[PDB]
Design an enzyme around this catalytic site. Structure first.
Site, PDB file in Angstrom:
ATOM      1  N   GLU B  59       0.970  -1.249   0.078  1.00  0.00           N
ATOM      2  CA  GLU B  59      -0.030  -0.114   0.140  1.00  0.00           C
ATOM      3  C   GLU B  59       0.933   1.182   0.099  1.00  0.00           C
ATOM      4  O   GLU B  59       0.361   2.497  -0.623  1.00  0.00           O
ATOM      5  CB  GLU B  59      -0.798  -0.067   1.398  1.00  0.00           C
ATOM      6  N   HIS B  60       2.098   1.372   0.621  1.00  0.00           N
ATOM      7  CA  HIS B  60       3.070   2.451   0.549  1.00  0.00           C
ATOM      8  C   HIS B  60       3.645   2.402  -0.770  1.00  0.00           C
ATOM      9  O   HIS B  60       3.897   3.842  -1.017  1.00  0.00           O
ATOM     10  CB  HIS B  60       4.130   2.242   1.822  1.00  0.00           C
ATOM     11  N   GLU B 136       5.606   4.859  11.359  1.00  0.00           N
ATOM     12  CA  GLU B 136       4.158   4.939  11.638  1.00  0.00           C
ATOM     13  C   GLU B 136       3.535   3.960  12.733  1.00  0.00           C
ATOM     14  O   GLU B 136       2.670   4.279  13.380  1.00  0.00           O
ATOM     15  CB  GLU B 136       3.278   4.542  10.170  1.00  0.00           C
TER      16      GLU B 136
END
Lengths: 101, 443, 52, 421
Positions: B59-60, B136
């Site tokens: 997703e990154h 994160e």
């Protein structure tokens, strides 16, 4: 009728709380409605009421009363709390009726 | 115009399947702007012990450009056309969508397709996201509400796939390979497991055309068109208590096993949750809120906030509630909360449901306020219900619910069950699973 | 575009400590947090407090 | 059908009534008002804030109790959003209950009672409500910004100052509502209902006579510099100059100069390229950060500049870098294309921002109040691209030349002073 209104003033004098300098409303038993009503009183009315009561209690402990001159007179008795109490009860009934509904 | 009718005038959702298996659906409006994206049936539940987090690491990179066009190009091309590119990845669902002017619709599709199919996965980028993700994790670690739901899952479904976090483990992020990420995309991002969803002022036909064009690759074998059914996750009545008296407030989350998307009971359950509702210290309603638990919460200052939830999954789910409260009011809150749950199984009134339904109706309508949220609904509906369920249908289901029904459904999932509990923070005053367990019976 | 915003059922709440009062560590969990325009303030009788 | 119209009458007293009808299953009605913290004085500060929180209090027609149980009964909602100069009371619900929910909206905005005790019990809430809002540093600096940027009206804080918590009176509330909630300053917008009904409601009910009572003392630019040393590892800073006013000619220029410099990311976790300011900063710093074009349009004034966030030590390099990028633009550094990108980047942003029933009503309302009618979405777009490469460059100059006002927050040990730029 303007007759029983003579009765009122009679009773009022028979009761005798005015001899302590108490207003009719100062004698109300503090149930829940009254408790709430008092919380809504303006500072001044509240403190005036407070002194009247602390004054009566001191008289009562002393077994004395106020000099005839100082007695609250039937037509000068301020029903200061009744307006608020009347409201506190209206609101409550509203909620009550609405919660059964 | 009546609510009844407006529900009908709503433009139907056109759905057409391609050859590779990919499905294309859309809801056309008069709007000049729109949203289109691909909703994939893939998440952490699909990962294993050693590749946990791939879907996230991916997703990154899904935005750092494809092979057809490197980073700077890709970004420049998206920005310069005023389109918004965002996405996400959960446990059983990932999605990448774009917001732009109805005009660009086709170029958008090309981009969507280029991402889900040709992500560059440049290796220099991977060594950069490694630090980014690690960062994160430390930031998300300070969000008690999420730390709490992960713990809820970690214990409710201990020893299974649903027990894992979406972001994965520290070790995995530190060692995942260019290979693994590639392998994940290849293994999971596939046509029959994807849905192209679009909402706004776009032509279905026009849309499906563009699809066929950039969503090429067709399958040969029978395995390539088979949508794998996942091994079921076992629920466990248990608890995890992470204690730290140095934290300002406590977080508590308690839940029982839910049915899973397909089940019609989910409707009732949501109606139920509507009765208990939610609350937080900035609700102006205060002591007058219709929610009994919110009321008590205000009267006795039980919590900073609370919320009910009916988190559904393909084959399972979590039905519970979560609250935040001061160290010294945890007990009473839990007490009052479990109380309301028992009230649900035993004394719900027709008055309470009437309102619950109205709250739930407004809620479902609110989930269709904009193109992105309508697109999200379509993407998920097809992926979870294998089709779209209109507001007209939903509302019918909702109207069918009555007190009697709520009682029976809640009793079925709540009464005398062994819940899962997650508690984080200064939790000393909340105690003993046994005591919590006894709260699961007798109104 | 005279919108004070267009230039510049749901909702989640929060809680802090009073008396005296009550994390971002990468360009990612910070971007989009630089005052778009003015500041709005909301309050609902049925939902969380909003601010822009 | 669907392809409807947007009627917009304007009754005798001056009360405006905008309406639409997209046959949405749910209706959303609002009451926009020209009133805010801008009309407060040293004497009644915060009163506007309390008025916002006081929406659920008893009214002459409905009790504090019935307002909440009443609105919740029909799955409806009721909220109050407000800026420094506009307050919006809006409700939402299913089409069938608009009438029901309407009664309370009417009562709340025109017939408050502000009973002393209710008011008194409520005040401590300002303390809480403020405490949550201030969790975002974003809000703390914007309070001080306006403060340092002005000497009055707009200089007023949006959240009631601490010293005044518990000192506001039922009086102040009443007077504030009498002198500002006047028909000529109010508009009754409403998406999802036939214009004839929303009109019937207004007429037959709404009181509080016309006029414009209290008038806001024109905002006066100050150009101050307020700094808040508080230990935070992340420094927030804003540097602005007086800019365009609402509906101003010069307005659209900054809006574009905004998007030309970078006005908020478009790609999740991506490094904005179309953002000169961001890109310019990134070349100067090496650690995490964020930087954007800041733009506010007020009735009689405006604010413009940039806003940054950075590690305390790399605060210097980040703000100086954010500056050069404003000067370098005030020097022809704006390609004819950057202007074209931004132009659409803006029409897109504006357009998307109206998919939300809230966004739409907020658009239809903001105009129907500050103007008197609804601009065509093609006029807005036409007015936006009619912005020249010069309009943009000059706006940039107005910033470099004008007197600046700044507001910082965090560990400022390495943050520069307005006179070091």
């Amino acid at each position: 009728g303007r007759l029983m209104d003579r009765i009122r003033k009679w009773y009022y004098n028979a009761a005798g709380f005015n001899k302590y300098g108490l207003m009719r409303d100062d004698t109300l038993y503090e149930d829940d409605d009254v408790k709430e009503a008092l919380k809504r009183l303006p500072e001044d009315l509240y403190n005036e009421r407070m002194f009247r009561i602390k004054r009566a209690l001191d008289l009562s402990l002393k077994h004395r009363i106020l000099p005839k001159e100082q007695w609250v007179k039937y037509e000068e008795d301020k029903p200061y709390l009744e307006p608020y109490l009347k409201e506190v009860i209206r609101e409550r009934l509203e909620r009550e009726a609405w919660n059964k509904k | 115009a009546t609510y009844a009718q407006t529900l009908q005038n709503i433009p139907e959702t056109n759905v057409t399947t391609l050859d590779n298996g990919l499905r294309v659906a859309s809801e056309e409006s008069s709007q000049p702007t729109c949203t289109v994206g691909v909703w994939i049936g893939a998440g952490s539940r699909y990962e294993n012990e050693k590749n946990n987090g791939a879907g996230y690491f991916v997703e990154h990179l899904a935005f750092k450009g494809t092979k057809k066009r490197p980073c700077a190009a890709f970004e420049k091309e998206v920005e310069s056309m005023g389109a918004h590119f965002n996405g996400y990845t959960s446990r059983e669902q990932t999605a990448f969508y774009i917001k732009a002017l109805s005009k660009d619709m086709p170029k958008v599709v090309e981009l969507l397709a280029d991402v889900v199919q040709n992500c560059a996965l440049e290796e220099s980028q991977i060594e950069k996201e490694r630090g980014v993700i690690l960062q994160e994790l430390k930031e998300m670690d300070n969000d008690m509400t999420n730390v709490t739901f992960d713990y809820l899952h970690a214990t409710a479904f201990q020893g299974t796939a649903l027990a894992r976090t979406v972001e994965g483990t520290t070790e995995n992020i530190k060692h995942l390979t260019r290979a693994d990420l590639a392998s994940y995309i290849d293994t999971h991002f596939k046509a029959p497991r994807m849905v192209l969803a679009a909402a706004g002022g776009i032509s279905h036909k026009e849309l499906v055309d563009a699809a066929r064009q950039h969503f090429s690759g067709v399958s040969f074998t029978y395995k390539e068109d088979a949508v794998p059914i996942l091994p079921r996750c076992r629920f466990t009545g248990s608890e995890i208590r992470a204690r730290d008296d140095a934290l300002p407030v406590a977080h508590v989350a308690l839940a029982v096993e839910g049915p899973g998307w397909a089940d019609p009971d989910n409707v009732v359950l949501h109606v139920a949750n509507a009765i208990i509702g939610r609350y937080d210290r900035t609700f102006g309603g205060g002591k007058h809120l219709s929610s009994r638990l919110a009321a008590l919460a205000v009267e006795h200052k039980l919590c900073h906030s609370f919320q009910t939830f009916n988190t559904s999954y393909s084959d399972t789910g979590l039905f519970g509630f979560h609250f935040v409260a001061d160290p010294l009011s945890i007990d009473d809150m839990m007490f009052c909360a479990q109380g309301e749950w028992m009230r649900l199984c035993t004394s719900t009134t027709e008055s309470e449901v009437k309102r619950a339904k109205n709250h739930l109706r407004s809620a479902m309508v609110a989930q269709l306020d904009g193109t992105t949220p309508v697109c999200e609904t379509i993407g998920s509906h097809l992926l979870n219900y294998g089709r779209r369920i209109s507001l007209e249908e939903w509302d019918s289901r909702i109207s069918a619910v009555d007190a009697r029904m709520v009682r029976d459904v809640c009793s079925k999932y709540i009464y005398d069950k062994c819940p899962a509990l997650a508690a984080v923070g200064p939790i000393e005053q909340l105690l003993d699973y046994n005591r919590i367990r006894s709260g699961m019976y007798w109104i | 575009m005279l919108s004070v915003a267009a230039r510049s059922x749901x909702x989640x709440x929060x809680x802090x400590x009073x008396x005296x009062x009550x994390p971002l560590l990468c360009r990612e969990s910070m971007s989009g947090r630089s005052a778009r325009r003015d500041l709005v303030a909301g309050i609902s009788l049925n939902a969380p407090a909003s601010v822009r | 059908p669907g392809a409807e119209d947007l009627e917009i009458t304007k009754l005798p007293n001056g009360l405006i009534i905008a309406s639409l009808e997209n046959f949405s299953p749910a209706s959303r009605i609002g009451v926009f008002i020209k009133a805010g913290s801008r009309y407060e004085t040293t004497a009644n500060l915060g009163t506007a804030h309390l008025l916002r929180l006081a929406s659920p209090l008893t009214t002459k027609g409905a009790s504090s109790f019935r307002i909440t149980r009443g609105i919740e009964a029909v799955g409806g909602s009721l909220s109050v959003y407000s800026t420094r100069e506009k307050m919006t009371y809006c409700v939402e619900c299913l089409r069938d209950h608009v009438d029901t929910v309407m009664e309370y909206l009417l009562n709340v905005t025109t017939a408050p009672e502000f009973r002393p005790w209710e008011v008194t019990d409520l005040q401590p809430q300002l303390k809480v409500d403020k405490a949550v809002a201030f969790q975002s540093p974003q809000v703390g600096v914007l309070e001080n910004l306006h403060a340092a940027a002005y000497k009055t009206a707009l200089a007023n804080p949006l959240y009631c100052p601490d010293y005044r918590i518990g000192k506001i009176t039922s009086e102040q509330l009443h007077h504030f509502v009498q002198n500002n909630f006047t028909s000529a300053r109010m508009a009754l917008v409403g998406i999802g209902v036939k214009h004839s009904d929303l009109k019937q409601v207004a007429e037959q009910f709404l009181n509080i006579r016309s006029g414009a009572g209290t008038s806001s003392a024109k905002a006066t630019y100050w150009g101050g510099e307020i700094r808040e040393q508080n230990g935070h590892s992340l420094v927030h800073a804003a540097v602005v100059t007086e800019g365009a006013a609402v509906g101003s000619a010069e307005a659209n220029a900054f809006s574009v100069l905004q998007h030309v410099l970078g006005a908020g990311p478009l790609i999740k976790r991506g490094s904005s390229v179309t953002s000169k300011l961001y890109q310019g900063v990134a070349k100067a710093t090496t650690q995490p950060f964020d930087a954007s074009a800041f733009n506010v349009n007020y009735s009689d004034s405006g604010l413009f500049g940039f806003y940054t966030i950075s590690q305390a030590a790399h605060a210097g390099e980040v703000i100086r870098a954010a500056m050069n990028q404003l000067k370098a633009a005030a020097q022809g550094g704006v390609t004819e294309e950057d202007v074209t990108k931004a132009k659409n980047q803006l029409k897109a942003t504006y357009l998307m921002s109206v998919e939300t029933a809230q966004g739409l009503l907020n658009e239809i309302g903001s105009e129907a109040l500050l103007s008197g009618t609804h601009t065509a979405p093609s006029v807005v777009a036409q007015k936006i691209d009619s912005v020249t490469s010069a309009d943009v460059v000059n706006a940039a100059k107005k910033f470099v030349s004008g007197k600046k006002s700044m507001a910082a927050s965090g560990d400022l040990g390495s943050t520069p002073f307005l006179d070091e730029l």
